């Protein structure tokens, strides 16, 4: 309206933007049955010390 620079009183369009900066995130992963890696130890039963 007149109080803020407009000729007519009524609704006006307004838009506001702010830069968004992520500071801490989390991530979810998908584990495929394949590409899984098993570690196996094969030890000789000798009794050595």
């Amino acid at each position: 309206g007149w109080g803020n620079g407009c000729g007519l009183f009524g609704k006006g369009g307004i838009v506001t933007c702010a830069m968004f900066r992520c500071k801490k995130n989390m991530e979810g992963k998908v584990v495929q049955p394949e590409n899984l890696e098993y570690t196996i130890v094969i030890t000789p039963h000798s009794g050595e010390e």
Binding site: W2, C6, G7, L8
Partner: protein, 81 residues
């Protein structure tokens, strides 16, 4: 603005470049000063609106955005942008 008439009464065709400025036009009864406060005043086009600006003598305006102080006047302007 273009000054014409509507049934003997003065009529103002107001263009976009007049938004915010006092509208003055001479009349037998002295100089008339209409005040246009229409927020939606835009470019003159097909979408016009036309209505009356009442005479207001020492009275505060209420529920209106157009008024003159010497002789009631009709006003017309477009809303396009």
């Amino acid at each position: 603005f273009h000054l014409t008439t509507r049934n003997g009464e003065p009529h103002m065709i107001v263009s976009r470049q007049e938004k915010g400025k006092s509208l003055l036009f001479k009349t037998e009864d002295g100089v008339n000063m209409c005040t246009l406060m229409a927020m939606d005043l835009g470019e003159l086009c097909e979408d016009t609106i036309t209505y009356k600006c009442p005479l207001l003598r020492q009275n505060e305006p209420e529920d209106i955005d157009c008024w003159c102080n010497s002789t009631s006047t009709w006003v017309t302007y477009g809303t396009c942008t």
